[PDB]
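Q: Predict the assembly, please.
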Amino acid sequence: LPMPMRFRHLKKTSKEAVGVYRSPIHGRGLFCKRNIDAGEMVIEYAGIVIRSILTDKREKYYDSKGIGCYMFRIDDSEVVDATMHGNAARFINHSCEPNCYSRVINIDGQKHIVIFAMRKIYRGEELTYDYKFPIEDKLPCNCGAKKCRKFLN
Amino acid sequence: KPNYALKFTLAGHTKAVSSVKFSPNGEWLASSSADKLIKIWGAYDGKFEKTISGHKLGISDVAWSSDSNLLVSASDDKTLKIWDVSSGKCLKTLKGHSNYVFCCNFNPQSNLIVSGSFDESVRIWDVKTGKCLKTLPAHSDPVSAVHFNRDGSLIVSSSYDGLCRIWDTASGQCLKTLIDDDNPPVSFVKFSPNGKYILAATLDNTLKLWDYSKGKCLKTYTGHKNEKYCIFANFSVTGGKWIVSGSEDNLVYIWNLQTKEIVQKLQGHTDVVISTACHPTENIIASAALENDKTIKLWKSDC
Amino acid sequence: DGTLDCISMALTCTFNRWGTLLAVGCNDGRIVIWDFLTRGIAKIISAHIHPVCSLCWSRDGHKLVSASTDNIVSQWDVLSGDCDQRFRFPSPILKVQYHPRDQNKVLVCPMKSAPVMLTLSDSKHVVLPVDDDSDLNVVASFDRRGEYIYTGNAKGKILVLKTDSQDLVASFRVTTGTSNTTAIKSIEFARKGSCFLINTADRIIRVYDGREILTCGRDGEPEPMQKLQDLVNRTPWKKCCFSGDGEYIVAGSARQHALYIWEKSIGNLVKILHGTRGELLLDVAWHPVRPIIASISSGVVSIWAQNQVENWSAFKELDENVEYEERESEFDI
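A: Predicted assembly structure:
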């Protein structure tokens, strides 16, 4: 099916496909409300599409406001910043064993970061993907996976 | 400007008073405390009417019925209790809050109850069956104050997490969330008499009147001291339009409603003036202080 | 979308004036007045031994007219539940209807006889005229203000009388398209405005504006505001009703126990609600001031509400990505 048609279908079904609940991973997180097949569109990380050069000026801005940064790198040139304006995708925890995966798609010239399902996800499951955060010097992970790196970084 | 003078001093609660409320007819004064006791007193002579017990732990809030016939008591025993004010009978005991219940209020038609607890969830309750009809994960911190609008269509909620959230009654819909560029712990909240504004106290010696239709703070009130305890605030309307509140400096502050300027400072309390109540009909203000005072003082002015 | 276990044998329901209470008849012949807010029964009235098939609230809401299957009509005070008045007729009553602007008056559509308008103050009755004198099945209804009476026969003939004089103020026969008549199943009006609807045996709902019938005069050709049907299944309609505002119309497919929802101006189908495939749809009503719809099927009532985007979606919520508009001094100090 066409990536535009699939994206329209995803934006139509997103509000009733997933939910946010109290999470045993941490705080609140994204849970599955209807069995999601593999590779299908789970959710867009929708937000403010900005250029990369403006990230820091925003980040420091949030650093001046004590508001956490909700930014995902679209590519070397664009970023979806969801700190001030976003969607439910801001509540997707991470797991070392993800049933989901992030991919950038091009619809009518604009890039969309869509989390798709790495596998057939069933109702009730908490949605998690690989943030692929670079190794820092340390955030402990509680994803519960047996392969868990003990640290995102 | 008001000239409130002390007329009657009331006391008897063995522990720290948590709330004092004037009956809507202005006939009685209900005083709750952490001593598991409620005290009805005469609202014009300071005559101790009676004591109503039955709650198992400290009482954090009590609220009158509109017909001056019922009183809801929210106690630290995780329970509410609806009482007939005339007989003192525990008509109902509301169970279901998983932690300390701190505030409670009737609907404008007195047939429904809103309740906030330490469980950080607001429960919505029947009166005639005492049944919990709704329960909402309202805040990320224990709820401080809940209150109805003029008609019962909206429920305002405050909590220690600094959020003031307006919710739909028929659906539990979180209508609005008022933010003031920071996270000031909101210890009290209530609607305006016209239902157009909202008075919320934050634990930084600050009171804020917001417009509901605008969602923005209209007026601010300072000069008092309130940073830890749930200090109540009331609208003085029987005389001039004022804002009356307690303060951690043993004072009873009275600001002008419009000009936001202090119009009176009632002194005579020895402890933190923990609870306040404005008479519905007369220029009478009941100011109850904490355990180092354990006294309730009636103040009467001429305007 | 939400049912009630506390009532049984649901047969007919009716909203109060403000959509706060619901009086439902039961097979035992009891009135169960159930409340929406407390979500509980407010009253139980021993109306008849016979089930109740017609129920209407008073404008003040303090009176309810009920019709048993024993041809027994009775008025009851909602606070007390007493039988204020009681009457009986031949040709068992099909429907009752309080007059919207005079609760003393009430119209009654019987089975085989003409509808008659009675008063409660005086136990009198005015037999409304019949065009063809041989319909034997004429539904009738007050308009929104109770100023005119709309009577539709089994032969598609439609008479508009004035409520006081019973004089023929308008008339026209509806068509099956080609040249034939159709049994007028029911006449409904809007609580707001002047648009009204007709359910007919052709399974086609016809929406008109009463002013156009009044200006059409007697024996004219008034066209409908709208024509509404299930072009896919060609399903009959056991019961239909407007929305509270009058811009949405619902029909109950008792054939497949579904609910069709169209608009008024455009007339396009808003939506469809599917019930239990095993349930036989009987009664349909809309909340007068809410997007709430009550359904009675196999003695069980179901509730269908409609909520907004919030109750969890209220940062500033947006739907689609927003390109940031950079300024001239966007990088300036």
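The domain at 1-303 of chain B is CATH 2.130.10.10 (Methylamine Dehydrogenase; Chain H). Chain B is about 0% helix and 50% strand.
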